[PDB]
């Protein structure tokens, strides 16, 4: 992980939307950016001090400052929403490459809309079967990407968890789902477990117990 | 006129090996670098390695995740790259492209050759990692309660748990009901199995009267798994 990107921005319609990828290594070389939409080879945008292939809109301009590479839209249109990543060295003297975490850039077609979030507790049935499935369903967010965390009374529970892609329901918002498994005592042994949706840096959370 | 095509991706067992290859046309294959680039499910793309020209002795590079499992190899005579991969891992599952690859310098402002850059790509080819066999749902209700309730609306559903291959589909009251029905995207588990949800937004007034039953299909086991859900 030595190239870090936010994993989501926004960006309205002829607005200017810089994303930046930081490392250590991007101090001393330039970085490639690659746009990636759902079911699409990755295309390379820009790369080195100033060059953009032929066919690349030239909107997309690459930056550097420090350890900082950026992509800067100016003028976001609608077919620029799209997943974003730098490539560049992982460390002075190597001769791997990295890619940077990705960016999902939405590109704004409504104002956005905050999350709804139910947290369905193991069924009496599954707990019967061995297991226990927390579902943290959520619905209705504008754009398209949340972060989720689980907890356990009050304290972060990073295993067991499985998170679904945001997609479009019939009624074209988002929905996404996630996970925490546990065992059954697992779940009966805590006061109560918690599923905390974040979406555009506040946050909605519901919580269950045995 | 630069295209690639990865082929060769399906299902591998945890242990097991799979060559992939990736077929080359529209440009100078012999002395073009080439490299190969993942991508897991919902996760970012992942660098692999890369395969250098004659004049760098044909040297091969690997990410530190692959390093001793996956064997980079080309055959120039027939335009094509291959990516051996040895001791698959459940991690290994993913989207697999390979790209023709620059290495970029600028004589004029002094910058010596540096980071690599992937200029053309190729749509990529799946690989699944699961030690699974045909395996069919289980099913279990996500039951309306008051915490799946808001004012006069509930939500209600069904888990499909540990099932393989895909697709498993559901349906509500056979097909009869599909406002506010949204099934969700499978996951893959770290076991190798899928699970998936659906959930059903109704009246809550229409809880104590109307029947919700979700009707889990999976071919593949040649499963079919009504659950009629209700509070609990």
């Known amino acids: 992980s030595e190239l870090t990107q936010d994993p989501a921005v926004s960006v309205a319609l002829k607005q200017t939307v810089t994303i930046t990828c930081r490392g250590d290594?991007?101090?001393?070389?330039?970085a490639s950016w690659y746009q990636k939409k759902p079911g699409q080879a990755p295309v390379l945008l820009f790369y080195?001090?100033?060059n953009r292939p032929s066919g690349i809109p030239d909107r997309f301009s690459g930056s550097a400052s420090g350890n900082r590479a950026s992509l800067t839209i100016t003028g976001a249109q609608a077919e620029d929403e799209a997943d974003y990543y730098c490539?560049?060295?992982?460390?002075?003297?190597?001769?791997?490459?990295?890619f940077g975490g990705g960016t999902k850039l939405t590109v704004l077609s409504q104002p956005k809309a905050a999350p709804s979030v139910t947290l369905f507790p193991p069924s009496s049935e599954e707990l019967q079967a061995n297991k226990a499935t927390l579902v943290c369903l959520i619905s209705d967010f504008y754009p398209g990407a949340v972060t989720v965390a689980w907890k356990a009374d009050s304290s972060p529970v990073k295993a067991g968890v499985e998170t679904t892609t945001p997609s479009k329901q019939s009624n074209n918002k988002y929905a996404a789902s996630s996970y925490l498994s546990l065992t059954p005592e697992q779940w009966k042994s805590h006061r109560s477990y918690s599923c905390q949706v974040t979406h555009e840096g506040s946050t909605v959370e519901k919580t269950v117990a045995p | 006129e630069v295209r690639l095509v990865e082929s060769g991706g399906g299902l591998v067992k945890p242990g097991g090996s799979l060559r992939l290859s990736c077929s080359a046309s529209?440009?100078?294959?012999?002395?073009?670098?080439m490299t190969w680039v993942r991508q897991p499910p919902g996760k970012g793309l992942e660098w692999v390695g890369r395969?250098?020209?004659?004049?760098?002795?044909?040297?091969?590079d690997y990410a530190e995740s692959v390093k001793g499992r996956f064997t980079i190899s080309r055959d120039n005579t027939k335009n094509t790259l291959y990516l051996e991969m040895n001791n698959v891992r459940t991690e290994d599952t993913g989207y697999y492209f390979c790209?023709?690859?620059?290495?970029?310098?600028?004589?004029?402002?002094?910058?010596?050759?540096?980071?690599?850059?992937?200029?053309?790509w190729g749509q990529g080819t799946l690989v699944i990692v699961s030690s699974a066999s045909t395996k069919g749902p289980s099913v279990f209700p996500l039951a309306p309660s008051s915490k799946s309730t808001s004012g006069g609306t509930a939500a209600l559903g069904c888990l499909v748990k540990d099932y393989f291959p895909e697709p498993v589909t559901v349906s509500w009251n056979s097909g009869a009901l599909t406002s506010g029905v949204h099934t969700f995207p499978a996951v893959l588990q770290s076991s190798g199995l899928y699970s998936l949800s659906s959930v059903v937004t109704v009246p809550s007034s229409s809880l104590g009267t109307q029947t919700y039953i979700c009707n889990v299909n999976h071919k593949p086991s040649n499963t079919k798994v009504d659950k009629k859900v209700e509070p609990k």
């Open positions: 790209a023709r690859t620059g290495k970029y310098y600028d004589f004029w402002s002094g910058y010596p050759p540096g980071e690599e850059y992937f200029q053309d």
């Open positions: 490539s560049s060295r992982d460390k002075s003297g190597s001769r791997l490459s990295v």
């Open positions: 529209g440009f100078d294959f012999d002395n073009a670098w």
């Open positions: 290594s991007l101090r001393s070389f330039y």
């Open positions: 395969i250098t020209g004659p004049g760098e002795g044909w040297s091969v």
């Open positions: 080195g001090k100033n």
